[model samples]
Target: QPLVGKQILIVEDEQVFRSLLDSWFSSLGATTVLAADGVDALELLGGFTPDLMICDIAGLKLLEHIRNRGDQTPVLVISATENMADIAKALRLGVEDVLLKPVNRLREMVFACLY
Candidate 1:
């Protein structure tokens, strides 16, 4: 509910996860934008500046694109891979938070958004 008035851009390649999170964001009162890949995400970003961005670290080189655009939007990276190196890379790039797959405890994440 705290996400009301916020817009979230979900850049995910998988259909099921994308659909599920879309509903979840709506339930949390946020307007949601769904993009299957970073290319699509860049297009969305050109038109709408979302309050937050949630996606996998493995998706379509999105973090790179966002950074290239000088977008400091809080990026919450959720990845199934537990590679410490990759996680560290994301952290080095200034991602908001890197979470494990099968998301839960959204309140903690929501509280940390837009940092």
Candidate 2:
């Protein structure tokens, strides 16, 4: 498993898709933490940098502090909205994963990015 034993951060809102993402991240061997809200999400990111990630809320929520803090961890944005500026800004940073548009290829993309 490509992600085995590595700390890969995958931030997203709602429990809607948690199981599927967690299943793979866990099955692949990444020690992941599933956060309930951006409040706790940033709490985790504030001190810890697990691989790297940003939830939908984390997109606009934590991305600011994360990037501002000058951290270079890869951020996987599993969001669910049509906002462009946020994604545009993150893309400018250079390391970001996108599935909010469509999650059909999440597993495939996750492996491709992390691998």
Candidate 3:
């Protein structure tokens, strides 16, 4: 379990996706925290700390809140939306990478966070 010591939080609104990612992280030996949506994600942030965050939904507000509060942690944003403006905004937020949907492998995801 290379990810044993790493804690990654998966913030997504889709239940199936969240569960799928949760299992994936577990299989990789990383402890995971789940957030159903941006609001729920914020609630979790109050008490939990994560080494990395992978948000696969429109959780930009959560990102902004973290930034405004001066919480600096690495973030990998996976957006399924087709909006260019939001993509640029994610870049400005210091996200390590922006992964668009249709993603088929875990390697790209692992690479996004492992570095």
Candidate 4:
């Protein structure tokens, strides 16, 4: 299993999406830590360095927090059409990857970064 024993930190506002990642990744042998938003996620960062982070587009501050501090963790952001500009800006600022709303192919994206 490519993702076995990996650590994934997810910062999503909605429980539906947050738990979705948790369940999906858990089944694949990855341990997922869920956070409601940036503050919750950042609170955990002090003691945790995950294999990767899946952040929502709205949690932009978390990305900045990680990047500005030279954390260099692989981060994949989620966004919708209205926030394409925001996603673009993050990418320009060097965000690692992004997934549009109603996400699919999650397995591929996670693997893309793990390697």
lDDT of each: 0.81, 0.67, 0.80, 0.80
Candidate 2 or 1, higher lDDT = 1
RMSD of each: 1.8, 2.3, 1.7, 1.5
Candidate 1 TM-score versus the reference: 0.88
The list of candidate 3 runs beyond 4 A from truth reads 104-106
For residues 1-115, write the lDDT of model 3, one tens digit per residue. Answer: 7788789888887787788889888887988988887788888888877998889646888888888888888888877778888988888877877787645556566655666
lDDT per residue (tens digit) for residues 1-115 in model 1: 8678898999888999999989988997899989988787877787778888888977526677778779887888888888888998888777877888877666588666743
Indicate the worst ten consecutive residues by lDDT in candidate 1.
106-115
Residue 27 lDDT in candidate 1: 92
What does candidate 2's lDDT look like per residue over 1-115, in tens digits? 7677678665656576666667877887788887767767778877787775636643564676777778777776776656777677767765556566435576666666665
lDDT of 4 at 101: 80
Residue 21 in model 1: lDDT: 88
TM-score of each: 0.88, 0.79, 0.88, 0.90
Q: Looking at candidate 1, what is the lDDT of residue 39?
A: 81
Clash counts for the predictions, in order: 0, 0, 0, 0
lDDT of 1 at 90: 87
Candidate 3: the clashing residue pairs are none
Of 3 and 4, which scores higher on TM-score? 4
Candidate 3, position 48, lDDT: 78
* Global CA lDDT computed for model 2: 0.67
Misplaced by over 4 Å in model 4 are none
